[PDB]
Amino acid sequence: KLSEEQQHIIAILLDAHHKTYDPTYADFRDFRPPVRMSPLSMLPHLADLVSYSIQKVIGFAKMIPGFRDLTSDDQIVLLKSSAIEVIMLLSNQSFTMDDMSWDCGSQDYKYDVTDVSKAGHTLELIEPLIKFQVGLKKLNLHEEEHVLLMAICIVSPDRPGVQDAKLVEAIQDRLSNTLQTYIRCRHPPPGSHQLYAKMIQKLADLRSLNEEHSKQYRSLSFQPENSMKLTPLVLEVFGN
Amino acid sequence: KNHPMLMNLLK
Ligand SMILES: CCC(O)(CC)CS[C@@H](C)C1=CC[C@H]2/C(=C/C=C3C[C@@H](O)C(=CCO)[C@H](O)C3)CCC[C@]12C
């Protein structure tokens, strides 16, 4: 029931993801070193990690079938609002339920709740973020489903500032229908049970995390002394 | 619009 077009969409998104996500973590050495001891000792490092990841997200989004037909303004709006959400999704790959941390290849680059706290965040964000990573892990998504969910996240019509909401929606709907059909034809039960609805709930969860993250970000970037330790790309995309 | 780096990365 998966058309040639739908199978093409999946192969494109899979390749786009393979070309833009590095599970070897080879670049983490390029980042300002992580500091654990502490007034925001982990902010420079994780700011760099995020800035690096924003660049990966942009590269993925450009390869989403249809994305490039939007106004420059609308591509920008969708990436600005989605970037943190997609990075949270992306990060599930290094998240381990063994100890509820993001484990990126080594000890220096294994991040837990206290590291995220040392980046300026409170439990208001960190607790639901962990709960999110756990719930997402528990879905045990196919990689096919993972990349579709990321693409659907980016092309949402209700994003703030969206101009051509009509065109954004048609782009998304084609992806949504690809995902729904994929699960039916390709995800065997019981894992498939309500899987689509569950995945959309993770996008609602992401909207909520986006909102809290923005609050804590404005509070963090309120003092220029902290704003100083971010990167130019982070300041541009998350605001300042 | 006043996102130089974002726009350049998207081109
Ligand atoms: C420093 C403040 C700031 O709010 C914004 C600059 C981020 S803190 C917090 C909200 C947050 C979001 C993504 C999370 C994480 C992402 C982890 C990644 C590792 C790996 O999976 C990965 C790429 C490997 O190449 C992803 O792109 C990012 C885990 C730790 C905590 C991270 C950084």
Describe this structure in words.
The complex is a heterodimer of chains A (240) and B (11). In chain A, α2 packs across α3. Chain A has a 3-stranded antiparallel β-sheet. Chain A has 10 helices and 3 strands; from the N terminus they run αααβββααααααα. Chain A has 240 residues and is an all-alpha fold. Chain B is mostly helical. The longest helix of chain B has 7 residues, at 4-10. At the A-B interface, α2, α3 and α10 of A face α1 of B. Ligand 5YI binds next to α2, α3 and α8 of chain A. Residues 21-22, 25, 43, 46-47, 49-50, 53, 56, 87-88, 90-91, 93-94, 102, 104, 111, 116, 119, 121, 213, 217, 234 of chain A line the site of ligand 5YI.
Give a brief description.
The PDB classes it as hormone receptor. The complex is a heterodimer of chains A (240) and B (11). With 240 residues, chain A is mostly helical.
How many individual domains of chain A? 1
Proportion of residues in extended strands of chain A: under 5%
Radius of gyration of chain A (CA) equals 18 Å
Helix content of chain B: 55-70%
Structural class of chain A: mainly alpha
* CATH class group of chain A: Mainly Alpha
**Second CATH tier, the architecture of chain A:** Orthogonal Bundle
The percent of residues in helical segments of chain A reads 55-70%
Largest sheet of chain B: none
Order of helices and strands of chain A: HHHEEEHHHHHHH
Largest sheet: number of strands, sense, barrel closure of chain A: 3 strands, antiparallel
Which protein chains make the most extensive interface, counting residues with beta carbons within 8 Å of the other chain's beta carbons? A-B, 14 and 8 residues
How many E-type strands of chain A?
3
Distance between the termini of chain B: 14 Å
Annotation field: number of helices of chain B: 1
Order of helices and strands of chain B: H
CATH fold name of chain A = Retinoid X Receptor
- Strands of chain B, total number: 0
PDB class: hormone receptor
Keywords: Transcription, hormone receptor
Assembly: dimeric
Entry title: Crystal structures of rat VDR-LBD with R270L mutation
